Amino acid sequence: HMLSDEQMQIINSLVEAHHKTYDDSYSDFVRFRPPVRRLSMLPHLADLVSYSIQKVIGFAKMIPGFRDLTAEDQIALLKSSAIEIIMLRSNQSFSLEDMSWSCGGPDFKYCINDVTKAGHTLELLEPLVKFQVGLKKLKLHEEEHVLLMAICLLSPDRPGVQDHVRIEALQDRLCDVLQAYIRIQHPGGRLLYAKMIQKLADLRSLNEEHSKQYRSLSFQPEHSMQLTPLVLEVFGSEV
Amino acid sequence: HMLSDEQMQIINSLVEAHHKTYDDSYSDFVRFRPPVRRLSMLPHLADLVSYSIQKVIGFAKMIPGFRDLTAEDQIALLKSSAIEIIMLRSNQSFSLEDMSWSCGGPDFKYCINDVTKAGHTLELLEPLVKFQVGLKKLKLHEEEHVLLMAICLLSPDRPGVQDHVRIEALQDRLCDVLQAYIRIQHPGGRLLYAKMIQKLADLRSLNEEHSKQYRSLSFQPEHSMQLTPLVLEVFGSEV
């Protein structure tokens, strides 16, 4: 039992799409407004998040089948899953050692206390780290990590999605490649699939909590003014 | 012939208001997105401009009589004159020697070529510098420079102004202090007043040109996304 051309081709695409949109050296972080340690980290983290959304969009545009959806659904899937994809890809910089996202020097080393100064509370930050840790422990292959992100982004159950039937199909196709892959290429991965699909659920809670906390933040003009047009658009409530 | 209490008090207020909202060391510039030398300077200059609008607002709120206008007129006067006030106060950093705005090191030294990389053309940049030079040559006192800015901001002829009659009055009162001051405290200042009022006219042209160039820029989402919420709001066309 082994992978098929179509499946494997979907893997070369996602892994290439990820490499093309994720720098393991975080060299672009100096172009962000400097981090500062009432919401002093907000400017820098807003720029980090905005930067990441741009990358998620680049990645999405290269997930097989996504480019064919209507512009509306692409936006619906993007707006709704953006924050989850960010949390996923962020794991790649997370460190179980220092329980933080290490992106270079002491400057770009992000701790919970840091996100607290960007307007977020432990209510969100607690499970975030808990999730980061659990996800790290899965020691996922790049193929499974990139597949989990493509799968999460094509979740058919997102507010605003129209053609939720095709979306549901593309997601299943991917869910299939991930399953085959784990079985064929990943040892002891007998129960990994379930753990990966489980992770998607934890993301909805984190997503929801973030939505609330972000809503409050965005309502206060002295704070929303620190955000970027893209963040305001992707997380905003405009229909 | 000498100044009166009321007049002189208006001067202590404006000069204090300016000091409280203008740092001659430009120490906050490091918190802006770094400058970079297709519109690479846009991020840094957007942050410079946004930063300056916040300062102009702080200054405006301290111009005598402004705090009494309706919130709408304050906004109308602000939206319409913001860019002109910026150009005025910027002179304080302009250097006739290097024909630029020197705000620290080679980084924060702004040349025309720089504003070109922020989306603006010589059509605007040419008169800007020409204006900067002419204004510099006036070797204005801080009292006259701060008065010229308060006067410019209370221009009754701004699109959107409602109670244009009271505005017109506050402006005249200021125009009076500036006149008295020049006569009493400024030698050879016999023809300075006319030169100062003349400067207000050059600002309308610069303002107009900027409005056009900014409009084009703002229409291109790949560019407006580099702007800040405040810039989009103050220069935007929302009614």
Binding site: I57, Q74, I75 | -
Partner: peptide, 10 residues
């Protein structure tokens, strides 16, 4: 609106 998102998606 979603003018920015539209554009980024080419």
């Amino acid at each position: 609106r979603h003018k920015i998102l539209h554009r980024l998606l080419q």
